[PDB]
Amino acid sequence: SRPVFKQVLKVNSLQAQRVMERSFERVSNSLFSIDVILRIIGEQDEIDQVETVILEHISKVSEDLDKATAQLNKLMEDNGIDMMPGYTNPNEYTIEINSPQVAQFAHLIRKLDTLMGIVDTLWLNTVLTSKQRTDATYQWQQRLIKLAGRIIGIEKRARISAHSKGKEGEVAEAAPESATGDKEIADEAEKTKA
Ligand SMILES: [Ca+2]
């Protein structure tokens, strides 16, 4: 009745692995709740106003990984570096994709995995210092984490919107809100709720 795309997603870098493990299933459940809290809300100008802002945030992160990937993939050409490294422990995650927005978040994690792969060889080829590597890894790890947090924050603003419109009980039976086990993600969601 409803399409669900199931896919095995291998992740090499420890940064992309950690982002995936602490944010994905929460974000996957968050975009699911948003999609149903919206049809319970019903008003289409608001439904197009949340997705356009949902898919903008997903787009801005996607845009900035593309530009980071571009500049660093030609630092390797400037230094004649062809190859990427092996990874001592890549992992494979079985993920299901219920909406296109889940696909784009899962595709963001892949582009982060690639970006870490680029940074890792530029670090290994002595083009980037140890600090430049950890600032890339930390800030890019953090960048998707707050993106996760803000999706969830957007989801919590939709729930309060449903409350004011009387539909509190209707979404407590269609989509109960899940706990956010990551404190960084929960903090960014509560800022995005104000
Ligand atoms: Ca844009």
Cα separation, 66 vs 59, in Å, equals 10
Cα separation, 41 vs 155, in Å, equals 13
Distance between Cα 55 and ligand 1 center (Å): 8
Instruction: Name every residue whose Cβ is closer than 8 Å to that of residue 41 and which is 6 or more positions away in sequence.
Output: 47, 158, 161, 162, 165, 167
Is residue 153 within 8 A of residue 192, CB to CB? The reply is yes
HSE at residue 76, side-chain half, CA atoms within 13 A, is 19
Q: 40-47, long-range: CB within 8 Å, 24+ apart, which pairs?
A: 40/162, 40/167, 40/170, 40/171, 40/174, 41/158, 41/161, 41/162, 41/165, 41/167, 46/161
Which among 2, 19, 5, 6 has a CA at the least distance from the CA of 110?
19
> Which residues sit with Cβ closer than 5 angstroms to ligand 1, an ion?
59
Which among 29, 28, 34 has a CA at the least distance from the CA of 162?
34
8: which strand partners? Answer: 94
Distance between Cα 62 and ligand 1 center (Å): 9
Cβ–Cβ contacts within 10 Å for residue 126, how many? 8
Distance between Cα 50 and ligand 1 center (Å): 14
Cα separation, 143 vs 135, in Å, equals 11
Nearest 5°: the CA angle 58, 10, 7 is: 70
DSSP string for 31-80: HHHHHHHHHHH--HHHHHHHHHHHHHHHHHHHHHHHHHHHHHHHHHHHTT
Cα separation, 44 vs 14, in Å, equals 41
Q: Could you tell me how many residues make up the chain?
A: 194
Instruction: Name every residue whose Cβ is closer than 8 Å to that of residue 138 and which is 6 or more positions away in sequence.
Output: none
* Coil, strand or helix at 90: coil
Cα separation, 70 vs 61, in Å, equals 14
10: which strand partners? Answer: 92
Cα separation, 140 vs 123, in Å, equals 16
Instruction: Name every residue whose Cβ is closer than 8 Å to that of residue 8 and which is 6 or more positions away in sequence.
Output: 92, 93, 94, 95
Cα separation, 172 vs 42, in Å, equals 16
Distance between Cα 52 and ligand 1 center (Å): 9
Distance between Cα 56 and ligand 1 center (Å): 5
> Resolution of the deposited coordinates, in angstroms?
2.9
Distance between Cα 46 and ligand 1 center (Å): 19
Cα separation, 176 vs 159, in Å, equals 10
Q: What share of the chain is helix, strand, coil (3-state, %, to 5)?
A: 70, 5, 20
